Coordinates of C-alpha atoms and ligand atoms in Angstrom, one line a residue:
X1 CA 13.2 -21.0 23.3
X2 CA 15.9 -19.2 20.9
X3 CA 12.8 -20.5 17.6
X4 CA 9.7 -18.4 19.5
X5 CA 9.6 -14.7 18.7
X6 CA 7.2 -12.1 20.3
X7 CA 6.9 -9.3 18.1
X8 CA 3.9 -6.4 18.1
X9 CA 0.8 -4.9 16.0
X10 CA -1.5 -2.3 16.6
X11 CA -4.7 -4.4 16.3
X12 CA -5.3 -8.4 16.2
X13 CA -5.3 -9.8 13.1
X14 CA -9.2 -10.1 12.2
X15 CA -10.6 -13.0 10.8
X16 CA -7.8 -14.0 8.0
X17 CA -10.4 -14.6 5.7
X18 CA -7.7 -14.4 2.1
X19 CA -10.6 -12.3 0.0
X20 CA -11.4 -9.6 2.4
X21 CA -9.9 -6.5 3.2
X22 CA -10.6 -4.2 6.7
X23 CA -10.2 -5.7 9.7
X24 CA -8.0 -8.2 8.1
X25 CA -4.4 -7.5 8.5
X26 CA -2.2 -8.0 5.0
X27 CA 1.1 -9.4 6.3
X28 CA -0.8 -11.9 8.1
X29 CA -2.9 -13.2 5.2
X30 CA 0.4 -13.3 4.0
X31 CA 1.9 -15.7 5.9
X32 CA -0.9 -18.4 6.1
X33 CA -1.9 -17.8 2.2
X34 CA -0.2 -18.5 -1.0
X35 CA -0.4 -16.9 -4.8
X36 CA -0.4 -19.1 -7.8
X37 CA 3.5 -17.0 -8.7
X38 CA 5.4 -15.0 -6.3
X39 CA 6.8 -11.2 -6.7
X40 CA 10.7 -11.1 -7.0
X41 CA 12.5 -8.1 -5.3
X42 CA 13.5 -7.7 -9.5
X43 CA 9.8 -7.2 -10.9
X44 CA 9.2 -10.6 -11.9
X45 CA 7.3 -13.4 -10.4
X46 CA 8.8 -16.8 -10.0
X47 CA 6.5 -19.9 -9.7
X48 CA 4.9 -21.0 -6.8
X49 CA 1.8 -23.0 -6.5
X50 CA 1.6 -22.8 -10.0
X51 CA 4.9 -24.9 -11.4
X52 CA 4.7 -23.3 -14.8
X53 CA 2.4 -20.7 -17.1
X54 CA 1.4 -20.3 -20.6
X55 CA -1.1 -18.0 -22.7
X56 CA -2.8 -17.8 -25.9
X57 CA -1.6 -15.3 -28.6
X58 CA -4.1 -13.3 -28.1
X59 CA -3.2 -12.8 -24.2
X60 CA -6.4 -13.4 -23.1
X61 CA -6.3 -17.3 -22.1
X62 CA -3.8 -18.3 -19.5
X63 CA -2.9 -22.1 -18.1
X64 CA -1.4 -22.8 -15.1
X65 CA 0.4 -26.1 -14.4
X66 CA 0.0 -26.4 -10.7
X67 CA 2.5 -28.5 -8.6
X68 CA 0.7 -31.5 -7.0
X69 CA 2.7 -31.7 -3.9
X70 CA 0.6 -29.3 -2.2
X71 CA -1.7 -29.6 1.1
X72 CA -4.1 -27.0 3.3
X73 CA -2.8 -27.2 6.6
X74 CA -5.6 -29.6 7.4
X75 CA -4.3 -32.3 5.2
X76 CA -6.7 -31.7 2.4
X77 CA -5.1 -31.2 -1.3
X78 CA -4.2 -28.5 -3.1
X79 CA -5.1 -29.0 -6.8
X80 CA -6.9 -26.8 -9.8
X81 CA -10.5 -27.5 -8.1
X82 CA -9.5 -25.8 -4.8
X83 CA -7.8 -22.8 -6.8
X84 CA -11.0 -22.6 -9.1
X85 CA -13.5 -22.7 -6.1
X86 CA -11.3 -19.6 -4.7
X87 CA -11.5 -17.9 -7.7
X88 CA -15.1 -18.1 -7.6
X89 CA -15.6 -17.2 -4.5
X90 CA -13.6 -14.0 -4.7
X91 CA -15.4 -13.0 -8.2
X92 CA -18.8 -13.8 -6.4
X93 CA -17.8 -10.2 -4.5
X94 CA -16.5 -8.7 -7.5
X95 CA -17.5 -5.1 -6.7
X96 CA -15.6 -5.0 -3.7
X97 CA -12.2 -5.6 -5.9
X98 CA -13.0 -2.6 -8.8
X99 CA -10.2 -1.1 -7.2
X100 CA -7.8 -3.9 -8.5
X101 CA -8.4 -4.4 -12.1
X102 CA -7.7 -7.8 -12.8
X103 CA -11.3 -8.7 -10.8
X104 CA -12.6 -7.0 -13.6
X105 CA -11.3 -8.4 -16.5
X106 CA -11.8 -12.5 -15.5
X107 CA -14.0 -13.8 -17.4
X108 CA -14.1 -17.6 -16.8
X109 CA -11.6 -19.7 -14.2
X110 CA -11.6 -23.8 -14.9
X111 CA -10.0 -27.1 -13.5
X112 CA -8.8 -28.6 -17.0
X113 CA -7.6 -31.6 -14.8
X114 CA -6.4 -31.8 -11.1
X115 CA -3.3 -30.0 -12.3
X116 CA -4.0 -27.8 -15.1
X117 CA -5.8 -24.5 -14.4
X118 CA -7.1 -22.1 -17.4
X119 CA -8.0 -18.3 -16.9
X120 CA -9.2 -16.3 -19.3
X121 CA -9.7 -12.8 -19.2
X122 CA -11.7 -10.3 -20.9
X123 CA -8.9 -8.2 -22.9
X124 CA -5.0 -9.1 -22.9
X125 CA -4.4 -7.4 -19.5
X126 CA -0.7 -7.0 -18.7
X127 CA 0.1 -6.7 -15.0
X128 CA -2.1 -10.2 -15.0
X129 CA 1.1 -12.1 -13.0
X130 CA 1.7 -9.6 -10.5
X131 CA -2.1 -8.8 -9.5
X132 CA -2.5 -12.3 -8.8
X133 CA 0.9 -12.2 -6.6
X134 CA -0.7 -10.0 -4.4
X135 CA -1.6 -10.5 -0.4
X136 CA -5.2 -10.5 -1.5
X137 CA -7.5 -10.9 -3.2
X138 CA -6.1 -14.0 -5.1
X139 CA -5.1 -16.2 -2.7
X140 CA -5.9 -19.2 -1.4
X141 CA -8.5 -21.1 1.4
X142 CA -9.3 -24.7 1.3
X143 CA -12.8 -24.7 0.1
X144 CA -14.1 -27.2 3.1
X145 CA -13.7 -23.5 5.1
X146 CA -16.4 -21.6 3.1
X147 CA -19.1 -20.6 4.1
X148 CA -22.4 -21.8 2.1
X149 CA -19.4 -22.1 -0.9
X150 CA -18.8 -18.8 -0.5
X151 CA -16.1 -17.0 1.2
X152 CA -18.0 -13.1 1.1
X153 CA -19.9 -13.9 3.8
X154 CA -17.2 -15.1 5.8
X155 CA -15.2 -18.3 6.5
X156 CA -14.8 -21.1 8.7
X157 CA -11.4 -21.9 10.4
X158 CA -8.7 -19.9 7.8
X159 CA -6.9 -22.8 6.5
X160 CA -4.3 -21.8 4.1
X161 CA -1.3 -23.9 2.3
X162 CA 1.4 -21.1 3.4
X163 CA 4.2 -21.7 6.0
X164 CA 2.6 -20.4 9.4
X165 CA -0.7 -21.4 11.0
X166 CA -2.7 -19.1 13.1
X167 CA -2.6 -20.9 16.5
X168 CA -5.5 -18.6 18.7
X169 CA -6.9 -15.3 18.7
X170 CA -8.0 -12.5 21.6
X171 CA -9.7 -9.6 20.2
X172 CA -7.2 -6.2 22.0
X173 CA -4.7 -8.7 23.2
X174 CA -2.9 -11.0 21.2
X175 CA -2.1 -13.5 18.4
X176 CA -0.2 -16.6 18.2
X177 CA 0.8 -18.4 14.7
X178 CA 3.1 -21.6 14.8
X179 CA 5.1 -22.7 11.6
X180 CA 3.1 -25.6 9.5
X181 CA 5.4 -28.7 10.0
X182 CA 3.9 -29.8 6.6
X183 CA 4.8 -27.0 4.5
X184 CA 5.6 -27.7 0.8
X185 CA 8.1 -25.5 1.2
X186 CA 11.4 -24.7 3.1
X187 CA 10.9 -25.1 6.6
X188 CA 11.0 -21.8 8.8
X189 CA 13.2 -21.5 11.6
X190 CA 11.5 -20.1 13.9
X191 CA 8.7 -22.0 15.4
X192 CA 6.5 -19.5 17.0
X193 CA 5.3 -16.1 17.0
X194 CA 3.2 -13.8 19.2
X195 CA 1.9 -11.0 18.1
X196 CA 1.4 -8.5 21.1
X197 CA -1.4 -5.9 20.5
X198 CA 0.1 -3.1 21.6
X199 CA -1.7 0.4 19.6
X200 CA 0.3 3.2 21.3
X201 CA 4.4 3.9 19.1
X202 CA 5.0 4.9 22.3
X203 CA 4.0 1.8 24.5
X204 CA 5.5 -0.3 21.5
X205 CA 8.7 1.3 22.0
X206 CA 8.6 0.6 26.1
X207 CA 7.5 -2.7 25.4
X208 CA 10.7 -3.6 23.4
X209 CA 12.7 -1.9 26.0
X210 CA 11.4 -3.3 28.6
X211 CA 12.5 -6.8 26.9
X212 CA 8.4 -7.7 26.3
X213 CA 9.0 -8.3 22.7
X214 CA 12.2 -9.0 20.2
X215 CA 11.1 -7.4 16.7
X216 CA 9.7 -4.2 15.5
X217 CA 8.8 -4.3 11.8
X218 CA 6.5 -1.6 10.2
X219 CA 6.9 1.6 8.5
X220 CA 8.0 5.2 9.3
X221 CA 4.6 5.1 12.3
X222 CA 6.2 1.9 13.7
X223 CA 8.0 3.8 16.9
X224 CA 8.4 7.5 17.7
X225 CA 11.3 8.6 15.2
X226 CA 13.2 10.1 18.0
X227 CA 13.1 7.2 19.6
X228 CA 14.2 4.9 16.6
X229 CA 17.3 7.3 16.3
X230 CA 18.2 6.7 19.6
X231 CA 17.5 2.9 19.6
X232 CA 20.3 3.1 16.1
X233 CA 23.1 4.3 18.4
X234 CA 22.5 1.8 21.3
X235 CA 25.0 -0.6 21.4
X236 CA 22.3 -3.7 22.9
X237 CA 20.1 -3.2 20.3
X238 CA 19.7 -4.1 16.9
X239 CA 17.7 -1.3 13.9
X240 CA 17.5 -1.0 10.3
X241 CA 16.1 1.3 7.9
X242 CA 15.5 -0.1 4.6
X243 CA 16.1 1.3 1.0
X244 CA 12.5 3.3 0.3
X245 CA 9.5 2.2 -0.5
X246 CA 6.9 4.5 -1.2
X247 CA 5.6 7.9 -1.3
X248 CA 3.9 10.5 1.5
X249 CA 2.1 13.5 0.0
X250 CA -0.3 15.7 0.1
X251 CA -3.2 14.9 -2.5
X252 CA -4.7 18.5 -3.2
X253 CA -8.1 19.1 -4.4
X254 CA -9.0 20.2 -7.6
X255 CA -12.2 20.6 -7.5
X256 CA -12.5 22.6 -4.4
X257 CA -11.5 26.4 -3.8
X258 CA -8.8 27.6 -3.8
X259 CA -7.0 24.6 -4.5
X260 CA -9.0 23.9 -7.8
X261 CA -6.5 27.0 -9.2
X262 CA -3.4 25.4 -11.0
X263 CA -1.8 28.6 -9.9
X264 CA -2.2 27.5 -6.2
X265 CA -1.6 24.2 -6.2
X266 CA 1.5 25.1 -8.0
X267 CA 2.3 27.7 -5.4
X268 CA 2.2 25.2 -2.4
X269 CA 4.5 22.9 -4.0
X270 CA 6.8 25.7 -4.0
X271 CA 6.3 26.5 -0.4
X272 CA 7.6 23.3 1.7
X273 CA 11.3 23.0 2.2
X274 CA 11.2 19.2 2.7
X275 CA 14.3 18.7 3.6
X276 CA 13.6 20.6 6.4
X277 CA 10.0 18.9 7.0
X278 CA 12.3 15.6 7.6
X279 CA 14.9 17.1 10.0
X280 CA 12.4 18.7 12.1
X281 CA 9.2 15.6 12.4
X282 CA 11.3 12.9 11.1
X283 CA 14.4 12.9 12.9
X284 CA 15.9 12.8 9.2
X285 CA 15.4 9.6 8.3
X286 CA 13.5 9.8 4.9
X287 CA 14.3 10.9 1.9
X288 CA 12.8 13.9 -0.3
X289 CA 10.4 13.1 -2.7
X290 CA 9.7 15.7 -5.2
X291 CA 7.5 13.4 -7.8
X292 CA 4.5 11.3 -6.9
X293 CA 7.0 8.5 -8.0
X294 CA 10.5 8.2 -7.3
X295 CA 12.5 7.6 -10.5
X296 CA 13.6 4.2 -9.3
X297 CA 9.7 2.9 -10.0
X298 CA 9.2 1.4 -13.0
X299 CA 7.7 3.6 -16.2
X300 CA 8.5 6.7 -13.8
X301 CA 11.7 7.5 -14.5
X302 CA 11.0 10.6 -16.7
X303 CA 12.8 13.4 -16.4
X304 CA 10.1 15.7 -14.6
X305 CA 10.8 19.0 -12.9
X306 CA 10.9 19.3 -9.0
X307 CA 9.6 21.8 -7.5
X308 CA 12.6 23.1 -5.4
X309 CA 12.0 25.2 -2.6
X310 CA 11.4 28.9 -3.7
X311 CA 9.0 31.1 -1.4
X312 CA 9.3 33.8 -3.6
X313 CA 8.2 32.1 -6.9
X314 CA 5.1 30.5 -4.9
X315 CA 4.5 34.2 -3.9
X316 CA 4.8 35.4 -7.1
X317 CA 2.4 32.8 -8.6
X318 CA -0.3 33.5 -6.5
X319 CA -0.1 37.1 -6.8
X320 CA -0.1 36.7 -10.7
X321 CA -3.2 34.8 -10.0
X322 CA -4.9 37.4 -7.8
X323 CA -3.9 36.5 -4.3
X324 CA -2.8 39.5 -2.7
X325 CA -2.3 40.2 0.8
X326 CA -4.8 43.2 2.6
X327 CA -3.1 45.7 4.8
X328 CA -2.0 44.9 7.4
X329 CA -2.7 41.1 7.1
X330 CA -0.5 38.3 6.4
X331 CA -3.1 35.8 4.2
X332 CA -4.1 36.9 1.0
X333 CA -7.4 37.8 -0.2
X334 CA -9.1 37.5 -3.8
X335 CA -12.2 38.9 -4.2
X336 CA -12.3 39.2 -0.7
X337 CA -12.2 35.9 0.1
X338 CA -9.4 34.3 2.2
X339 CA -6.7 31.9 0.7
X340 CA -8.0 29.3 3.5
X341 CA -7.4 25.5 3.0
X342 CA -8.1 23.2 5.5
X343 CA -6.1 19.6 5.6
X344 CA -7.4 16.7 7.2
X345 CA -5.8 14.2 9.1
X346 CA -6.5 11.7 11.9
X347 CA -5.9 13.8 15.3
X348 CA -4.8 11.4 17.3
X349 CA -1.8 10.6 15.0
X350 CA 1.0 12.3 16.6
X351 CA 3.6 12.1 13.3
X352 CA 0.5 13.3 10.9
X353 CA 0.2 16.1 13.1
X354 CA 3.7 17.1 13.5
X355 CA 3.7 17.1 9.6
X356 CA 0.4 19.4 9.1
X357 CA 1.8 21.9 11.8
X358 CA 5.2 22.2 9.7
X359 CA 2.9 22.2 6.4
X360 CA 0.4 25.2 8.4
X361 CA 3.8 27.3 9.3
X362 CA 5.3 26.9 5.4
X363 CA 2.2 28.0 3.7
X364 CA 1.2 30.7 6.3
X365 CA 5.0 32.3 4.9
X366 CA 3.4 32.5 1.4
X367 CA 0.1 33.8 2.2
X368 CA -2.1 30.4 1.9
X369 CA -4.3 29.9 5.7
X370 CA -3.8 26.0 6.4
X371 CA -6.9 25.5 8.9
X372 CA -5.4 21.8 10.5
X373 CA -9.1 19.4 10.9
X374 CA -8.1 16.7 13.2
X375 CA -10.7 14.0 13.2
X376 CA -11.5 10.1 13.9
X377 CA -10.0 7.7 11.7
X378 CA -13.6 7.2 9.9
X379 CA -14.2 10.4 9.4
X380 CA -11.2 10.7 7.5
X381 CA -11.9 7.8 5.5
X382 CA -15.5 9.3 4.7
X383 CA -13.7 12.7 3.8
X384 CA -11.5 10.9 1.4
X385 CA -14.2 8.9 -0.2
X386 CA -16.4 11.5 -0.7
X387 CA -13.6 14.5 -1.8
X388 CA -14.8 16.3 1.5
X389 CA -11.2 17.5 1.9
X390 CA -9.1 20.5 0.8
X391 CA -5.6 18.9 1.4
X392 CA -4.8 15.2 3.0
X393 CA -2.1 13.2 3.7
X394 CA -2.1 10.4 1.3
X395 CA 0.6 7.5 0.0
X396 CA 1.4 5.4 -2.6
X397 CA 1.2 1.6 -2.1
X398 CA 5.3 0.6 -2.9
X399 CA 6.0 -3.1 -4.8
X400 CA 4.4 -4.0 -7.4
X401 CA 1.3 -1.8 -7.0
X402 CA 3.6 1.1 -8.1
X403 CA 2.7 2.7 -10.8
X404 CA 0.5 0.3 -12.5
X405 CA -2.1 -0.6 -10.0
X406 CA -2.2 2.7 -7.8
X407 CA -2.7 4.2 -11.1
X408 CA -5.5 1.7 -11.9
X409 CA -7.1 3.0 -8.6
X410 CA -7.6 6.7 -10.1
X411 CA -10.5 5.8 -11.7
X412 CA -12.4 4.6 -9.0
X413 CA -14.5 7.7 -7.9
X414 CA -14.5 6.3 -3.9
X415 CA -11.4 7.1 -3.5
X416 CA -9.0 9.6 -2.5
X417 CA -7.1 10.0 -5.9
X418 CA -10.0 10.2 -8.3
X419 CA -11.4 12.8 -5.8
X420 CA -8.5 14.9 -5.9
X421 CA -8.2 14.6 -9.3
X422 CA -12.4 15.3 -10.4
X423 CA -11.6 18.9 -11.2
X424 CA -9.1 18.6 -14.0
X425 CA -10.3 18.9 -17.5
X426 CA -8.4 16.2 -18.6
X427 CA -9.0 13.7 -15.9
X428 CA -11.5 12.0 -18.6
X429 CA -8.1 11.5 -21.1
X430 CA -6.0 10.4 -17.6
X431 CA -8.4 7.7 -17.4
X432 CA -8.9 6.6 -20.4
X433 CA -5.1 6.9 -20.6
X434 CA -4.8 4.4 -17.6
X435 CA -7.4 1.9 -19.3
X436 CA -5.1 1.9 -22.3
X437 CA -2.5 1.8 -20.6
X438 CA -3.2 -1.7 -18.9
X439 CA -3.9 -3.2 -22.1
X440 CA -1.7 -2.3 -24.1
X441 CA 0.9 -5.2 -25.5
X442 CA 2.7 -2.2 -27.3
X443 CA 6.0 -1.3 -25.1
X444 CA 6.5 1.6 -26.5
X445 CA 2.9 2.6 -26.6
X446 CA 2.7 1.6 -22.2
X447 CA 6.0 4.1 -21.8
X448 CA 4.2 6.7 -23.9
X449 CA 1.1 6.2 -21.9
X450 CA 2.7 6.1 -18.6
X451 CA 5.0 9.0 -19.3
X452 CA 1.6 11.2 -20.3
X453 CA -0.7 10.3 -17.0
X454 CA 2.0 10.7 -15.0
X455 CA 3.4 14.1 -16.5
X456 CA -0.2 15.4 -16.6
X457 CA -0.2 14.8 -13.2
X458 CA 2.8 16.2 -12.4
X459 CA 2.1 19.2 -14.4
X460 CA -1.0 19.7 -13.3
X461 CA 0.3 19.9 -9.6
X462 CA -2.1 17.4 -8.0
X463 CA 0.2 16.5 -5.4
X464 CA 2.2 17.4 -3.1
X465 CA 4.9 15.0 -2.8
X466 CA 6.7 15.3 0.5
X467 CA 9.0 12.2 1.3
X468 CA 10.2 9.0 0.0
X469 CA 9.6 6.8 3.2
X470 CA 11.5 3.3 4.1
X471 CA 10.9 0.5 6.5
X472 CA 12.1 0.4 10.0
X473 CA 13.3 -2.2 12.0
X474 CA 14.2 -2.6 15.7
X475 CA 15.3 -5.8 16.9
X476 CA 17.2 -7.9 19.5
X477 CA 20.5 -8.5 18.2
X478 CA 20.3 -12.6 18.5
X479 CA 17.4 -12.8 15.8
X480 CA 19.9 -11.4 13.1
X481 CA 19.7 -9.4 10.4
X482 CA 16.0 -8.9 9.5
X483 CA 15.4 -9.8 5.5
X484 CA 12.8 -7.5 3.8
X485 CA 9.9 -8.6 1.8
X486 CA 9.7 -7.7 -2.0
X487 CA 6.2 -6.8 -1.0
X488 CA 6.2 -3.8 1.0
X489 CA 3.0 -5.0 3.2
X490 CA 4.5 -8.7 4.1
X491 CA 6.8 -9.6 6.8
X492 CA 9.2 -12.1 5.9
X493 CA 9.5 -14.1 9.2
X494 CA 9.9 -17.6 7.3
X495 CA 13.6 -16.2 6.7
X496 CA 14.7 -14.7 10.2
X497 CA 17.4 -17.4 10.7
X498 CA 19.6 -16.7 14.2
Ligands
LIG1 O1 -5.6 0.8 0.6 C1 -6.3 1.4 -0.2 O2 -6.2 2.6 -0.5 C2 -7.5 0.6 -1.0 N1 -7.2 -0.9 -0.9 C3 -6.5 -1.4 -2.1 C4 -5.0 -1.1 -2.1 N2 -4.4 -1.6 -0.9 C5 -4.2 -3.1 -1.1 C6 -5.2 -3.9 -0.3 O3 -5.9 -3.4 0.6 O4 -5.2 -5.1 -0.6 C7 -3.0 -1.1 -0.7 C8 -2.5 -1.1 0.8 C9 -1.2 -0.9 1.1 C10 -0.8 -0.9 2.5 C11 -1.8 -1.0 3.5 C12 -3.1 -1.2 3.2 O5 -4.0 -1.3 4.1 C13 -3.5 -1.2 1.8 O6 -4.7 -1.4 1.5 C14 -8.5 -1.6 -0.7 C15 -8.9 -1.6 0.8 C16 -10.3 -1.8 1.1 C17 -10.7 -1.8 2.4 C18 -9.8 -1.7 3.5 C19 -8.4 -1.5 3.1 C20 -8.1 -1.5 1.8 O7 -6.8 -1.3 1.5
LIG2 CL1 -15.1 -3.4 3.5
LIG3 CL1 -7.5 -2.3 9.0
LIG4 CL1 6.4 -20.8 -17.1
LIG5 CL1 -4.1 37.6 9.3

């Protein structure tokens, strides 16, 4: 029927338990779960399952009026209890969400009546609205599915009050959601949708040209891009590239040699002509980035200086700083030590390693040895984790985690940024910076703030930033045009309207 849609992910869903994170797939969470407010495209959050809002003076205490309309797809209510029950079971895990601050600064969460729910946090914490409109953690399950009241240790069937149900399930084959025909809400227009599990950009690509499936929706890894700029100029198919939405860098270690010398990490910033990075492994269809955020993203519109593409000023930095080349050799030496970095990246990631071999024949022109470390998807994770990494690829998060919440993330030592970042001398005032600068009801204080971290950063040449990066679409021409989600990690299938 013209309101079924087959469309394609590299893996199955998982589980769809709402307050977990790997192997459950975002945009799908997404579609069966609901936030109390919903991000806007504009930076604000409209209401959702919470009609209306308001908060103590001191910022701390927060009471949501929740609409009492609203049922779990099994016919049980929504109401204050069920959003309080969630929020205990999410905060029963509360480690596992250090990353996103907001799990650390509830203090209490109560049903005042079957419509009025009060929060209140530990210090008047400003990106409150948009952490809770988040994919995850803060969404939610009708308690009936936890587990021993608990949702950490897994849930039952994952009942959620949002517009699609999850029909079945085959672990490396498929997944089927139907639209809930008892949706608060507007009613979607499609009916059905399968998602094929199909890993290989390639075999995706075959499998919407072979007429298999109707949609591709994903980021720049979704299909090959030679292939996606082919698919634009074919008149019997439908593609879209969106407006960016995050950044692709490298994340350079400051706390390993060589790349724990400013003088270095400034050098390879000067060494990449990205605009020829983009012709040559991305069929041009990204955009130059030359800060960690594009000035479009809020707070990060400062005025910093790119670093253009000037071999011979990288060269002259790194001989200033002692890196000179050996007769009759082409990477420098200091001390008789090698200007050898290795970057990390999953091997089996054909577009990663397209990137690291333009990045390898850049540096090699300046002196620097890039040694390329192709590994296992967990072995990357480990290496990122634990700072075992000279250079890796790395990206931003897009709408609304940028700045505020991938900042927010810099402090957490398990992770890529912090690790990057341990060798600074001022990474202690860069965090304390961030703390402040998540608490602070001064405006003019938070652009202060922000303009510091993120000029220190800058400055300090921590990055790499390499390209701006949009979403693709491919599609059959009788679903439409294909709305974007203000959230870069949902899919907005409740609005494809042929
Ligand atoms: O992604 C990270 O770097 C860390 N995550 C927090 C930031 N995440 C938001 C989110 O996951 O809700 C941003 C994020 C954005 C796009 C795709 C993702 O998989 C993604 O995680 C936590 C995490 C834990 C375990 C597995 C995957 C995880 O992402
Ligand atoms: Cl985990
Ligand atoms: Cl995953
Ligand atoms: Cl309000
Ligand atoms: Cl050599």
């Amino acid at each position: 029927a013209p309101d079924e849609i087959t469309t394609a992910w590299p893996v199955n869903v998982g589980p769809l338990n709402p307050h977990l994170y790997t192997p459950n797939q975002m945009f799908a969470q997404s579609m069966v779960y609901e936030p109390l407010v919903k991000y806007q495209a504009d930076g604000s959050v409209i209401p959702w399952l919470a009609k209306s809002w308001t908060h103590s003076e001191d910022g701390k205490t927060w009471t949501f009026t929740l609409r009492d309309d609203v049922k779990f797809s099994n016919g049980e209510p929504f109401d204050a209890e069920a959003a309080a029950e969630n929020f205990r079971a999410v905060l029963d895990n509360r480690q596992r969400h250090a990353w996103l601050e907001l799990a650390n600064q509830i203090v209490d969460v109560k049903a005042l009546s079957k419509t009025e729910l009060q929060i209140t946090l530990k210090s008047a914490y400003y990106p409150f609205l948009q952490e809770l409109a988040l994919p995850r953690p803060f969404r939610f399950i009708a308690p009936s599915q936890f587990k021993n009241h608990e949702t950490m240790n897994g849930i039952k069937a994952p009942i959620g009050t949002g517009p699609w149900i999850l029909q079945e399930s085959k672990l490396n084959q498929y997944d089927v959601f139907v639209r809930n025909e008892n949706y608060w809400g507007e009613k979607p227009a499609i009916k059905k949708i399968t998602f094929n599990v199909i890993p290989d950009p390639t075999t995706r690509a075959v499998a919407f040209e072979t007429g298999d499936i109707d949609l591709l929706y994903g980021n720049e890894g979704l299909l090959p891009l030679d292939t996606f700029a082919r698919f634009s100029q074919n008149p019997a198919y439908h593609t879209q590239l969106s407006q960016p939405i995050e950044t692709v860098m490298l994340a350079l270690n400051t706390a390993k040699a060589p790349t724990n010398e400013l003088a270095v990490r400034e050098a390879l910033n000067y060494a990449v002509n990205k605009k020829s990075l983009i012709d040559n492994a991305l069929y041009g269809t990204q955009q130059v980035a030359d800060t960690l955020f594009a000035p479009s993203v809020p707070y990060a519109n400062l005025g910093l200086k790119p670093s253009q593409y000037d071999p011979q000023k990288a060269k002259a930095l790194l001989e200033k700083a002692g890196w000179t080349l050996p007769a009759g050799k082409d990477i420098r030496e200091k001390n008789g030590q090698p200007l050898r970095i290795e970057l990390s990246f999953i091997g089996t990631d054909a577009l990663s390693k397209s990137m690291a071999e333009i990045i390898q024949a850049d540096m090699r022109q300046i002196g620097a040895d890039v040694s390329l470390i192709g590994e296992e998807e967990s072995s990357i994770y480990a290496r990122q984790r634990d700072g075992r990494f000279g250079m890796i690829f790395h990206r931003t998060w897009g709408a609304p985690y940028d700045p505020h919440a991938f900042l927010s993330s810099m402090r957490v030592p398990s992770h890529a940024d912090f690790q990057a970042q341990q060798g600074l001398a001022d990474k202690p005032l860069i965090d304390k910076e961030i703390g402040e600068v998540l608490a602070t009801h001064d405006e003019t204080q938070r652009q202060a703030l922000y303009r510091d971290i993120l000029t220190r950063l800058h400055d300090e040449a921590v990055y790499l930033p390499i390209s701006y990066i949009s979403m693709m679409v491919v599609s059959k021409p009788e679903l439409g045009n294909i709305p974007y989600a203000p959230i870069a990690t949902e899919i907005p299938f409740e609005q494809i309207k042929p």
